[PDB]
């Protein structure tokens, strides 16, 4: 079946049909400061919750290429949502990716960890790639995307990836596309690339 992970925002969850889906890659596009990283942190916490609370009783994997992953931001999100932050941190597997070859390497290892965590009390249900953004370079990215698609499908996990935009967006094939932008008074606006959600970034992470 297809599982869903709450984003912490009622408005955002409705635009997505209930939250980010498993066995699929969800792509977020936006300019700097649009909230892509904050949403990736929120999800890394939301996935850990029972399905009644909008999670999947799972764990999250976080591949960071922007050096923007913050364990203390995770603590704030967990503490504010009433969760044990030491436990929330234990359930997030984090790797910093220095180059494209390294990212690809980490994907093989992340896959190995998913295999092992299968059928346990807390399997890895989410994979975050922040951020996704020569003849070979284009080819490598395509290969990376194919691997991600195979992971989402074979391990029933939700794949969340971020793209930095410098309007006419070139999205990757077979993904769910969401476009984030800054609205009025700290509010953020979400809209599907293929009607609109409004949300905030708060001490609880993402919320209405």
């Amino acid at each position: 079946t297809i599982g869903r992970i709450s984003t912490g925002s009622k408005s955002l969850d409705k635009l997505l049909g209930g939250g980010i889906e498993t066995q699929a890659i969800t792509e977020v596009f936006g300019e700097f400061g649009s909230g892509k990283t904050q949403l990736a942190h929120t999800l890394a916490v939301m996935v850990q919750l029972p399905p009644e609370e909008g999670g999947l009783n799972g764990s999250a994997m976080y591949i960071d290429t922007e050096n923007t992953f913050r364990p203390e931001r995770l603590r704030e999100i967990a503490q504010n949502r009433g969760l044990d932050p030491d436990e929330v941190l234990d359930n997030v597997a984090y790797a910093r990716a220095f180059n494209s070859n390294h990212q690809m390497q980490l994907l093989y290892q992340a896959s190995a960890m998913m295999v092992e965590s299968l059928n346990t009390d807390r399997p890895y249900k989410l994979l975050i790639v922040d951020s996704l953004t020569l003849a070979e370079r284009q080819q490598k990215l395509a290969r990376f995307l194919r691997m991600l698609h195979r992971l989402a499908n074979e391990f029933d996990i939700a794949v969340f990836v971020t793209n930095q935009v410098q309007g006419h967006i070139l999205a990757h094939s077979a993904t769910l596309r969401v476009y984030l932008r800054k609205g009025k008074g700290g509010k953020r606006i979400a809209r599907l690339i293929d009607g609109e959600a409004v949300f905030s970034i708060t001490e609880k992470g993402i919320e209405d």
Partner: protein, 31 residues
């Protein structure tokens, strides 16, 4: 620090082709 078995790693390589080792990942708490 997080560990992974050589067997799961072997299974992973086979999957993308078309006891413990280094995983490259750690918990957000530093383990």
């Amino acid at each position: 620090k997080l560990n992974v078995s050589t067997e799961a790693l072997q299974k992973a390589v086979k999957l993308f082709s078309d006891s413990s080792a280094f995983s490259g990942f750690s918990t957000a708490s530093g383990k």
